[PDB]
């Protein structure tokens, strides 16, 4: 089979959609193979830029369309180039911008550690007609962490494997295995904006909700706890307008639920404290001394559910 | 008529729009039919990739354009392939990304059980010229439930039928019935994010609204009930900024209305309790003992309207 | 002139933009005319699918480009078909998805009764070269009301008329009148989501604002009225984040303004009641008995401004 | 030089972006010039619709590409037509939808009076090869004010001028001046939605903020002023979610700042009134009589800053 | 090598995306080189407008595709022109609208001083085949500051350099260095909208939060501080709905965190003041005199963290 060497350059990885489970990758792909020799004008290799390639495909020149398995729709190919050396080898250099899918589990949202995967495969030619020799992925486009939503860690893990298709065994006798390239670029989400802007205000608001037990009146405690509940419902907005709309719950959503439950349990506790009286003569001194026990128990529960 | 076998592979189903009643489907479609034999170069089948197909259509090769009935606009076809065997049969393999419509009733929104429907039909050839033999839908792209907005349940129900067009009987004598393929993939919406983030806070807020009757002052009760009403109007935002903008009401919207009515009825009850006095000497003890009757009656009403 | 019969099928009408005054229409258009006879292969009519039509236009075949007058930009034509019978008549079947404009008065917003208008006209040929014979609009795509933002009422009103262009009389002597088709599909907006989610909460909030007069303290009444004013400003969000951004006022906006004025007038009334005292010894009993007169007068004013 | 007469029809002007300083214009453009005579089939003028024009451009027919100077990107040309009379004159009729830029000062936002400008120029031919004779702009697409975001006032001011390019004097000896058409359509923004929905609630809220001085307690006055400050911060949302995101301040933003300053100054005034006591025996009677002086002074300041 | 002179005109720079770190640039690019002489019709230079250029590329005319290194996807090229003089030199004039990337550190967000960078490079020809002679960037499209999100300061810094590619040394012996043009246009963000609408209200709200110490009651101080905390959580929305969603923290976000900490520290201080009593007989006079020390210390801390 024709041996094709792929070299993929990643200019950037942006546009991470979480409900769509996609991400936008821009870059270049170079596919170099060999064939029959040809007579170029002079000894120099011949350059066939975009458009003019299709004239050569009409003439009978073999250029395989290496598709992306995990891309969503047709990628926006920009300029494509075909370099034809006189000795017989062809280089196909195409610039792409595509929207690619992955698994992308987004639990532990501010501290996400995921990988962006590019799966390249010939659209038509199996391992008996086209075979990928090696891939080098030059993702040199990695930089500082200070201005980076995602920090790319390490290099890109490249794998060349063979995928066996079950449906093609009906139409093909025994040649139905396609050469596939999997490229995995591991990234870690930047948590500092979420840690400073969403976690610490939640801690401050939940502690201020704990502080309702330091009032010396029952009706003041209920009205204060309702003001605190109104404060919580509002934080939910702030986050839900900014955090991604993934289809499950995260650490921040769970802390929101925990603050809801804290305020509701405080309301139940102060109502039970006021109406524990058998004849309305006993005060609220003993169980109202949960000023430093209820926050401790709630923090223990939170430590349980986080880990 | 020419017998065409279709095989549709669904890579993903995403982009569910509820006010538009559409959803985005990516995948492949393979249409295999038979015809007159041809002489390929060698005994090998011939591959005609994208673009080069239209040269063969210019030459006179028959490739039918199988359109999608329920698609919205023109689908974004990526790479298309034409495999021509020497024995005479043709395979047309096209990758599509389209936006498809359905009925999509979205009442009972967090517990939706809908189906995504692909309707394939020849654009031009009726059952006297083209007939679909069988379709197998390989929606193997189904996975866990833990990170899945929609859980695909079961396989894809495939139907091949004939649709009779009334307008074509004027232009065609008696050949006006088109072979249509209907593919239905049944999915169930993931409710856990909506159950934990939108239903349980509504229950906690409505219970805190019930707790206004445990105050011992009338003016405190009114000011507290107005703080509770302000808390409710805010929850409406949180949801309406996040939940889809379908054109009717759902379980969460109905619970919002129920909380509104609960607070308004509590305001009416406490005003009626304070101004039940004939001369301003009688207290509020009897009808203010709806602390455990008004929540019970409201829960009974909610149980009626849910089922 | 060449007589063309049009048949327009409306698959759906969606994407109603109110500040843009547009709406998205998907469907098919069939234009059937007659001409000189031709020799098809066999006695069968010939099918020229997309792309291949332009080869026939290069050859000299007459296909007129029937444009949409009220479309915004170029419509997304999908598959187009040309059926050429041997007897001499041509059928042009094109699938379109376009964004069309209209007048679209959106006053009385939740109870809107508008019409969606398609205006078809030849781009080049006046009534002396092309004339529309008849149009039948098969908008059979109408269904239940339970899951329908807009309920299509009745059939589609079709009109074939002649439009006289003033600018073309300079370049054409007396042949400057173009055959135009106007198709009007009357629809009524579904009001139940707006009635239950936006009108009834406004009524409950405005009634709760009326209830400020049942307090027995002046400072309590002012602080309560300011809490009510804060509750109103918030409802404005809920709606303005969800309701369309048309450039005027609607019933819901007018009710918002009415609630604003109600709270402001209540503030003025209670301040005037407290400071009506000549020497600070007289109470607030007489004009504070507007508990059941101020809501009645406000309801009378609202009944005046609604009708 | 070849004399070209332009006639521009404006179907609509929509899509006004304020941070982008663009607006979307749909319409038609007709360019009529004269040339060498040709033999049409018969005495009738010949119609070359879209696509088929490029065959004639390949043949050697002169059609100049009149570009838009202020357009952003390539305009979405729909159908284009070429009318070739036998006497020798050519008409090029193209339908465009483009996004055009202007200066667009958006200070005094609800009462904006701007102009939408179309600048047409040959892409290649200077005044020695192409010259615009006259332009008539038929913007008959103007209508009522009741449902119109922008009211077009008057006609469209048309100017034909010559623009001298400094860079072209290096590559061209003395022929570097291009014929440019400037079309200015003056429009006035509809203010009634902003006046009723954003200005009047601001006036009511600021007056309610003035009313804090009618309380008879200091702590009540501070807590009330903080409730009023919380009410103001919320109005900021309502507007900033709805008003355009231009990069400066407007009348509504300035009124928001004025209400902020009013509440802050009221807080300072009541704190200074309570702590003006030398030994805590003197009441707050004199400077607390700014109930009708502080609003008057603030209204005078607002009248100064508005004009 | 062939010497190419580039001249880039920037019509506008808009569409600054901060989480994407891109910006949209519209303009023209002129590439003028020399070659073999040709016989034009007459002594006049020949104009080949869009489309017709590709016929000349098919004929064998050398037009290099100068790509943008930092562009995201394929730029929206509008009209392109090819001017061929008889003496032998070629001018390629193309209008582009592209989305370009840069580093774009957005710390100190309202007072950003960044640069917009265009990197032009031949897609195929190294410095042994194509060399850029000089670039002049005519960014005359700079204007007032009063209506300008970004103020362009100075001219555009232009650099012509050579970039050595490491991967090309395997396929090319010693000719692997590409001529690159870097154009940097320095801009400063307009801060006045953010300064008046987001910084000054934050200062007023934080000062009003300082004013909680002037109350004379402990329970009043806690309930007031919780109202102030609810006021802060709301300001977070206003900003986060309007400010860009960059992945770190800015001056406004840090001021939000500082106000959060101020209110939390005030709550801790007043609780510690009330419960400093050994037997409940001592008042809160000494440490409650942090009315003018706690704001001063917080302002000192803010002055430390700003610089």
mmCIF file with all atom_site columns, N, CA, C and O in Angstrom, chain A residues 111-150:
data_model
loop_
_atom_site.group_PDB
_atom_site.id
_atom_site.type_symbol
_atom_site.label_atom_id
_atom_site.label_alt_id
_atom_site.label_comp_id
_atom_site.label_asym_id
_atom_site.label_entity_id
_atom_site.label_seq_id
_atom_site.pdbx_PDB_ins_code
_atom_site.Cartn_x
_atom_site.Cartn_y
_atom_site.Cartn_z
_atom_site.occupancy
_atom_site.B_iso_or_equiv
_atom_site.pdbx_formal_charge
_atom_site.auth_seq_id
_atom_site.auth_comp_id
_atom_site.auth_asym_id
_atom_site.auth_atom_id
_atom_site.pdbx_PDB_model_num
ATOM 1   N N  . UNK A 1 111 ? -11.401 22.473 37.912 1.00 0.00 ? 111 UNK A N  1
ATOM 2   C CA . UNK A 1 111 ? -10.139 21.746 37.882 1.00 0.00 ? 111 UNK A CA 1
ATOM 3   C C  . UNK A 1 111 ? -10.176 20.627 36.846 1.00 0.00 ? 111 UNK A C  1
ATOM 4   O O  . UNK A 1 111 ? -9.748  19.501 37.101 1.00 0.00 ? 111 UNK A O  1
ATOM 5   N N  . UNK A 1 112 ? -10.714 20.939 35.668 1.00 0.00 ? 112 UNK A N  1
ATOM 6   C CA . UNK A 1 112 ? -10.809 19.968 34.588 1.00 0.00 ? 112 UNK A CA 1
ATOM 7   C C  . UNK A 1 112 ? -9.438  19.608 34.042 1.00 0.00 ? 112 UNK A C  1
ATOM 8   O O  . UNK A 1 112 ? -8.570  20.468 33.873 1.00 0.00 ? 112 UNK A O  1
ATOM 9   N N  . UNK A 1 113 ? -9.253  18.325 33.754 1.00 0.00 ? 113 UNK A N  1
ATOM 10  C CA . UNK A 1 113 ? -8.056  17.821 33.084 1.00 0.00 ? 113 UNK A CA 1
ATOM 11  C C  . UNK A 1 113 ? -8.547  16.930 31.948 1.00 0.00 ? 113 UNK A C  1
ATOM 12  O O  . UNK A 1 113 ? -8.856  15.757 32.165 1.00 0.00 ? 113 UNK A O  1
ATOM 13  N N  . UNK A 1 114 ? -8.627  17.486 30.747 1.00 0.00 ? 114 UNK A N  1
ATOM 14  C CA . UNK A 1 114 ? -9.163  16.749 29.613 1.00 0.00 ? 114 UNK A CA 1
ATOM 15  C C  . UNK A 1 114 ? -8.110  16.628 28.519 1.00 0.00 ? 114 UNK A C  1
ATOM 16  O O  . UNK A 1 114 ? -6.968  17.052 28.676 1.00 0.00 ? 114 UNK A O  1
ATOM 17  N N  . UNK A 1 115 ? -8.505  16.016 27.410 1.00 0.00 ? 115 UNK A N  1
ATOM 18  C CA . UNK A 1 115 ? -7.640  15.919 26.248 1.00 0.00 ? 115 UNK A CA 1
ATOM 19  C C  . UNK A 1 115 ? -8.444  16.232 25.000 1.00 0.00 ? 115 UNK A C  1
ATOM 20  O O  . UNK A 1 115 ? -9.623  15.884 24.896 1.00 0.00 ? 115 UNK A O  1
ATOM 21  N N  . UNK A 1 116 ? -7.801  16.921 24.070 1.00 0.00 ? 116 UNK A N  1
ATOM 22  C CA . UNK A 1 116 ? -8.391  17.268 22.790 1.00 0.00 ? 116 UNK A CA 1
ATOM 23  C C  . UNK A 1 116 ? -7.835  16.309 21.747 1.00 0.00 ? 116 UNK A C  1
ATOM 24  O O  . UNK A 1 116 ? -6.616  16.181 21.603 1.00 0.00 ? 116 UNK A O  1
ATOM 25  N N  . UNK A 1 117 ? -8.732  15.626 21.046 1.00 0.00 ? 117 UNK A N  1
ATOM 26  C CA . UNK A 1 117 ? -8.392  14.468 20.232 1.00 0.00 ? 117 UNK A CA 1
ATOM 27  C C  . UNK A 1 117 ? -8.712  14.784 18.780 1.00 0.00 ? 117 UNK A C  1
ATOM 28  O O  . UNK A 1 117 ? -9.817  15.236 18.464 1.00 0.00 ? 117 UNK A O  1
ATOM 29  N N  . UNK A 1 118 ? -7.735  14.566 17.909 1.00 0.00 ? 118 UNK A N  1
ATOM 30  C CA . UNK A 1 118 ? -7.907  14.633 16.466 1.00 0.00 ? 118 UNK A CA 1
ATOM 31  C C  . UNK A 1 118 ? -7.756  13.224 15.910 1.00 0.00 ? 118 UNK A C  1
ATOM 32  O O  . UNK A 1 118 ? -6.724  12.581 16.121 1.00 0.00 ? 118 UNK A O  1
ATOM 33  N N  . UNK A 1 119 ? -8.776  12.745 15.209 1.00 0.00 ? 119 UNK A N  1
ATOM 34  C CA . UNK A 1 119 ? -8.766  11.409 14.623 1.00 0.00 ? 119 UNK A CA 1
ATOM 35  C C  . UNK A 1 119 ? -8.786  11.543 13.107 1.00 0.00 ? 119 UNK A C  1
ATOM 36  O O  . UNK A 1 119 ? -9.811  11.909 12.524 1.00 0.00 ? 119 UNK A O  1
ATOM 37  N N  . UNK A 1 120 ? -7.665  11.224 12.475 1.00 0.00 ? 120 UNK A N  1
ATOM 38  C CA . UNK A 1 120 ? -7.510  11.332 11.032 1.00 0.00 ? 120 UNK A CA 1
ATOM 39  C C  . UNK A 1 120 ? -7.575  9.952  10.393 1.00 0.00 ? 120 UNK A C  1
ATOM 40  O O  . UNK A 1 120 ? -7.001  8.991  10.906 1.00 0.00 ? 120 UNK A O  1
ATOM 41  N N  . UNK A 1 121 ? -8.284  9.856  9.269  1.00 0.00 ? 121 UNK A N  1
ATOM 42  C CA . UNK A 1 121 ? -8.461  8.578  8.606  1.00 0.00 ? 121 UNK A CA 1
ATOM 43  C C  . UNK A 1 121 ? -8.710  8.827  7.128  1.00 0.00 ? 121 UNK A C  1
ATOM 44  O O  . UNK A 1 121 ? -9.359  9.823  6.787  1.00 0.00 ? 121 UNK A O  1
ATOM 45  N N  . UNK A 1 122 ? -8.198  7.979  6.236  1.00 0.00 ? 122 UNK A N  1
ATOM 46  C CA . UNK A 1 122 ? -8.601  8.071  4.829  1.00 0.00 ? 122 UNK A CA 1
ATOM 47  C C  . UNK A 1 122 ? -10.087 7.800  4.672  1.00 0.00 ? 122 UNK A C  1
ATOM 48  O O  . UNK A 1 122 ? -10.642 6.898  5.300  1.00 0.00 ? 122 UNK A O  1
ATOM 49  N N  . UNK A 1 123 ? -10.731 8.594  3.820  1.00 0.00 ? 123 UNK A N  1
ATOM 50  C CA . UNK A 1 123 ? -12.164 8.435  3.625  1.00 0.00 ? 123 UNK A CA 1
ATOM 51  C C  . UNK A 1 123 ? -12.487 7.169  2.845  1.00 0.00 ? 123 UNK A C  1
ATOM 52  O O  . UNK A 1 123 ? -13.572 6.602  3.009  1.00 0.00 ? 123 UNK A O  1
ATOM 53  N N  . UNK A 1 124 ? -11.565 6.705  2.021  1.00 0.00 ? 124 UNK A N  1
ATOM 54  C CA . UNK A 1 124 ? -11.870 5.651  1.062  1.00 0.00 ? 124 UNK A CA 1
ATOM 55  C C  . UNK A 1 124 ? -10.924 4.465  1.121  1.00 0.00 ? 124 UNK A C  1
ATOM 56  O O  . UNK A 1 124 ? -11.362 3.329  0.920  1.00 0.00 ? 124 UNK A O  1
ATOM 57  N N  . UNK A 1 125 ? -9.643  4.693  1.375  1.00 0.00 ? 125 UNK A N  1
ATOM 58  C CA . UNK A 1 125 ? -8.622  3.671  1.196  1.00 0.00 ? 125 UNK A CA 1
ATOM 59  C C  . UNK A 1 125 ? -8.315  2.986  2.519  1.00 0.00 ? 125 UNK A C  1
ATOM 60  O O  . UNK A 1 125 ? -7.979  3.647  3.506  1.00 0.00 ? 125 UNK A O  1
ATOM 61  N N  . UNK A 1 126 ? -8.427  1.663  2.529  1.00 0.00 ? 126 UNK A N  1
ATOM 62  C CA . UNK A 1 126 ? -8.164  0.862  3.714  1.00 0.00 ? 126 UNK A CA 1
ATOM 63  C C  . UNK A 1 126 ? -6.661  0.621  3.841  1.00 0.00 ? 126 UNK A C  1
ATOM 64  O O  . UNK A 1 126 ? -5.857  1.202  3.108  1.00 0.00 ? 126 UNK A O  1
ATOM 65  N N  . UNK A 1 127 ? -6.255  -0.252 4.769  1.00 0.00 ? 127 UNK A N  1
ATOM 66  C CA . UNK A 1 127 ? -4.834  -0.489 4.997  1.00 0.00 ? 127 UNK A CA 1
ATOM 67  C C  . UNK A 1 127 ? -4.166  -1.254 3.862  1.00 0.00 ? 127 UNK A C  1
ATOM 68  O O  . UNK A 1 127 ? -2.934  -1.329 3.833  1.00 0.00 ? 127 UNK A O  1
ATOM 69  N N  . UNK A 1 128 ? -4.938  -1.824 2.940  1.00 0.00 ? 128 UNK A N  1
ATOM 70  C CA . UNK A 1 128 ? -4.374  -2.485 1.772  1.00 0.00 ? 128 UNK A CA 1
ATOM 71  C C  . UNK A 1 128 ? -4.076  -1.522 0.631  1.00 0.00 ? 128 UNK A C  1
ATOM 72  O O  . UNK A 1 128 ? -3.410  -1.920 -0.329 1.00 0.00 ? 128 UNK A O  1
ATOM 73  N N  . UNK A 1 129 ? -4.548  -0.282 0.707  1.00 0.00 ? 129 UNK A N  1
ATOM 74  C CA . UNK A 1 129 ? -4.280  0.728  -0.312 1.00 0.00 ? 129 UNK A CA 1
ATOM 75  C C  . UNK A 1 129 ? -3.549  1.944  0.230  1.00 0.00 ? 129 UNK A C  1
ATOM 76  O O  . UNK A 1 129 ? -2.735  2.534  -0.485 1.00 0.00 ? 129 UNK A O  1
ATOM 77  N N  . UNK A 1 130 ? -3.824  2.345  1.469  1.00 0.00 ? 130 UNK A N  1
ATOM 78  C CA . UNK A 1 130 ? -3.140  3.466  2.102  1.00 0.00 ? 130 UNK A CA 1
ATOM 79  C C  . UNK A 1 130 ? -2.778  3.064  3.520  1.00 0.00 ? 130 UNK A C  1
ATOM 80  O O  . UNK A 1 130 ? -3.602  2.492  4.234  1.00 0.00 ? 130 UNK A O  1
ATOM 81  N N  . UNK A 1 131 ? -1.554  3.378  3.931  1.00 0.00 ? 131 UNK A N  1
ATOM 82  C CA . UNK A 1 131 ? -1.102  3.082  5.281  1.00 0.00 ? 131 UNK A CA 1
ATOM 83  C C  . UNK A 1 131 ? -0.336  4.280  5.813  1.00 0.00 ? 131 UNK A C  1
ATOM 84  O O  . UNK A 1 131 ? 0.537   4.812  5.121  1.00 0.00 ? 131 UNK A O  1
ATOM 85  N N  . UNK A 1 132 ? -0.664  4.706  7.028  1.00 0.00 ? 132 UNK A N  1
ATOM 86  C CA . UNK A 1 132 ? 0.046   5.810  7.659  1.00 0.00 ? 132 UNK A CA 1
ATOM 87  C C  . UNK A 1 132 ? 1.352   5.294  8.251  1.00 0.00 ? 132 UNK A C  1
ATOM 88  O O  . UNK A 1 132 ? 1.348   4.364  9.065  1.00 0.00 ? 132 UNK A O  1
ATOM 89  N N  . UNK A 1 133 ? 2.471   5.891  7.842  1.00 0.00 ? 133 UNK A N  1
ATOM 90  C CA . UNK A 1 133 ? 3.777   5.437  8.307  1.00 0.00 ? 133 UNK A CA 1
ATOM 91  C C  . UNK A 1 133 ? 4.073   5.948  9.710  1.00 0.00 ? 133 UNK A C  1
ATOM 92  O O  . UNK A 1 133 ? 4.251   5.163  10.647 1.00 0.00 ? 133 UNK A O  1
ATOM 93  N N  . UNK A 1 134 ? 4.130   7.266  9.866  1.00 0.00 ? 134 UNK A N  1
ATOM 94  C CA . UNK A 1 134 ? 4.397   7.887  11.151 1.00 0.00 ? 134 UNK A CA 1
ATOM 95  C C  . UNK A 1 134 ? 3.706   9.238  11.155 1.00 0.00 ? 134 UNK A C  1
ATOM 96  O O  . UNK A 1 134 ? 3.478   9.834  10.101 1.00 0.00 ? 134 UNK A O  1
ATOM 97  N N  . UNK A 1 135 ? 3.348   9.708  12.346 1.00 0.00 ? 135 UNK A N  1
ATOM 98  C CA . UNK A 1 135 ? 2.899   11.077 12.534 1.00 0.00 ? 135 UNK A CA 1
ATOM 99  C C  . UNK A 1 135 ? 3.751   11.747 13.603 1.00 0.00 ? 135 UNK A C  1
ATOM 100 O O  . UNK A 1 135 ? 4.017   11.162 14.659 1.00 0.00 ? 135 UNK A O  1
ATOM 101 N N  . UNK A 1 136 ? 4.226   12.948 13.294 1.00 0.00 ? 136 UNK A N  1
ATOM 102 C CA . UNK A 1 136 ? 4.787   13.858 14.277 1.00 0.00 ? 136 UNK A CA 1
ATOM 103 C C  . UNK A 1 136 ? 3.852   15.050 14.392 1.00 0.00 ? 136 UNK A C  1
ATOM 104 O O  . UNK A 1 136 ? 3.501   15.664 13.381 1.00 0.00 ? 136 UNK A O  1
ATOM 105 N N  . UNK A 1 137 ? 3.434   15.362 15.612 1.00 0.00 ? 137 UNK A N  1
ATOM 106 C CA . UNK A 1 137 ? 2.541   16.484 15.865 1.00 0.00 ? 137 UNK A CA 1
ATOM 107 C C  . UNK A 1 137 ? 3.356   17.609 16.476 1.00 0.00 ? 137 UNK A C  1
ATOM 108 O O  . UNK A 1 137 ? 3.898   17.472 17.579 1.00 0.00 ? 137 UNK A O  1
ATOM 109 N N  . UNK A 1 138 ? 3.447   18.722 15.754 1.00 0.00 ? 138 UNK A N  1
ATOM 110 C CA . UNK A 1 138 ? 4.245   19.862 16.179 1.00 0.00 ? 138 UNK A CA 1
ATOM 111 C C  . UNK A 1 138 ? 3.293   20.894 16.768 1.00 0.00 ? 138 UNK A C  1
ATOM 112 O O  . UNK A 1 138 ? 2.917   21.877 16.133 1.00 0.00 ? 138 UNK A O  1
ATOM 113 N N  . UNK A 1 139 ? 2.892   20.651 18.009 1.00 0.00 ? 139 UNK A N  1
ATOM 114 C CA . UNK A 1 139 ? 2.039   21.583 18.740 1.00 0.00 ? 139 UNK A CA 1
ATOM 115 C C  . UNK A 1 139 ? 2.869   22.611 19.501 1.00 0.00 ? 139 UNK A C  1
ATOM 116 O O  . UNK A 1 139 ? 2.616   22.923 20.661 1.00 0.00 ? 139 UNK A O  1
ATOM 117 N N  . UNK A 1 140 ? 3.891   23.135 18.840 1.00 0.00 ? 140 UNK A N  1
ATOM 118 C CA . UNK A 1 140 ? 4.758   24.115 19.483 1.00 0.00 ? 140 UNK A CA 1
ATOM 119 C C  . UNK A 1 140 ? 3.995   25.355 19.908 1.00 0.00 ? 140 UNK A C  1
ATOM 120 O O  . UNK A 1 140 ? 4.563   26.253 20.527 1.00 0.00 ? 140 UNK A O  1
ATOM 121 N N  . UNK A 1 141 ? 2.709   25.414 19.587 1.00 0.00 ? 141 UNK A N  1
ATOM 122 C CA . UNK A 1 141 ? 1.923   26.605 19.902 1.00 0.00 ? 141 UNK A CA 1
ATOM 123 C C  . UNK A 1 141 ? 1.481   26.646 21.358 1.00 0.00 ? 141 UNK A C  1
ATOM 124 O O  . UNK A 1 141 ? 0.342   27.009 21.652 1.00 0.00 ? 141 UNK A O  1
ATOM 125 N N  . UNK A 1 142 ? 2.372   26.278 22.269 1.00 0.00 ? 142 UNK A N  1
ATOM 126 C CA . UNK A 1 142 ? 2.047   26.331 23.689 1.00 0.00 ? 142 UNK A CA 1
ATOM 127 C C  . UNK A 1 142 ? 2.860   27.431 24.351 1.00 0.00 ? 142 UNK A C  1
ATOM 128 O O  . UNK A 1 142 ? 4.003   27.675 23.970 1.00 0.00 ? 142 UNK A O  1
ATOM 129 N N  . UNK A 1 143 ? 2.272   28.101 25.336 1.00 0.00 ? 143 UNK A N  1
ATOM 130 C CA . UNK A 1 143 ? 2.896   29.285 25.908 1.00 0.00 ? 143 UNK A CA 1
ATOM 131 C C  . UNK A 1 143 ? 2.631   29.436 27.401 1.00 0.00 ? 143 UNK A C  1
ATOM 132 O O  . UNK A 1 143 ? 2.349   28.466 28.103 1.00 0.00 ? 143 UNK A O  1
ATOM 133 N N  . UNK A 1 144 ? 2.686   30.675 27.882 1.00 0.00 ? 144 UNK A N  1
ATOM 134 C CA . UNK A 1 144 ? 2.486   30.938 29.309 1.00 0.00 ? 144 UNK A CA 1
ATOM 135 C C  . UNK A 1 144 ? 1.182   30.411 29.877 1.00 0.00 ? 144 UNK A C  1
ATOM 136 O O  . UNK A 1 144 ? 0.311   29.945 29.148 1.00 0.00 ? 144 UNK A O  1
ATOM 137 N N  . UNK A 1 145 ? 1.039   30.504 31.190 1.00 0.00 ? 145 UNK A N  1
ATOM 138 C CA . UNK A 1 145 ? -0.182  30.062 31.827 1.00 0.00 ? 145 UNK A CA 1
ATOM 139 C C  . UNK A 1 145 ? -0.967  31.266 32.265 1.00 0.00 ? 145 UNK A C  1
ATOM 140 O O  . UNK A 1 145 ? -2.177  31.188 32.474 1.00 0.00 ? 145 UNK A O  1
ATOM 141 N N  . UNK A 1 146 ? -0.284  32.392 32.395 1.00 0.00 ? 146 UNK A N  1
ATOM 142 C CA . UNK A 1 146 ? -0.931  33.596 32.900 1.00 0.00 ? 146 UNK A CA 1
ATOM 143 C C  . UNK A 1 146 ? -2.074  34.144 32.039 1.00 0.00 ? 146 UNK A C  1
ATOM 144 O O  . UNK A 1 146 ? -2.907  34.890 32.503 1.00 0.00 ? 146 UNK A O  1
ATOM 145 N N  . UNK A 1 147 ? -2.154  33.787 30.783 1.00 0.00 ? 147 UNK A N  1
ATOM 146 C CA . UNK A 1 147 ? -3.240  34.365 30.019 1.00 0.00 ? 147 UNK A CA 1
ATOM 147 C C  . UNK A 1 147 ? -3.818  33.227 29.239 1.00 0.00 ? 147 UNK A C  1
ATOM 148 O O  . UNK A 1 147 ? -4.165  33.365 28.065 1.00 0.00 ? 147 UNK A O  1
ATOM 149 N N  . UNK A 1 148 ? -4.010  32.098 29.912 1.00 0.00 ? 148 UNK A N  1
ATOM 150 C CA . UNK A 1 148 ? -4.394  30.916 29.147 1.00 0.00 ? 148 UNK A CA 1
ATOM 151 C C  . UNK A 1 148 ? -5.517  30.126 29.790 1.00 0.00 ? 148 UNK A C  1
ATOM 152 O O  . UNK A 1 148 ? -5.320  29.496 30.824 1.00 0.00 ? 148 UNK A O  1
ATOM 153 N N  . UNK A 1 149 ? -6.691  30.153 29.179 1.00 0.00 ? 149 UNK A N  1
ATOM 154 C CA . UNK A 1 149 ? -7.840  29.405 29.672 1.00 0.00 ? 149 UNK A CA 1
ATOM 155 C C  . UNK A 1 149 ? -7.470  27.961 29.936 1.00 0.00 ? 149 UNK A C  1
ATOM 156 O O  . UNK A 1 149 ? -7.870  27.390 30.945 1.00 0.00 ? 149 UNK A O  1
ATOM 157 N N  . UNK A 1 150 ? -6.712  27.363 29.027 1.00 0.00 ? 150 UNK A N  1
ATOM 158 C CA . UNK A 1 150 ? -6.287  25.983 29.198 1.00 0.00 ? 150 UNK A CA 1
ATOM 159 C C  . UNK A 1 150 ? -4.781  25.895 29.085 1.00 0.00 ? 150 UNK A C  1
ATOM 160 O O  . UNK A 1 150 ? -4.191  26.470 28.175 1.00 0.00 ? 150 UNK A O  1
#
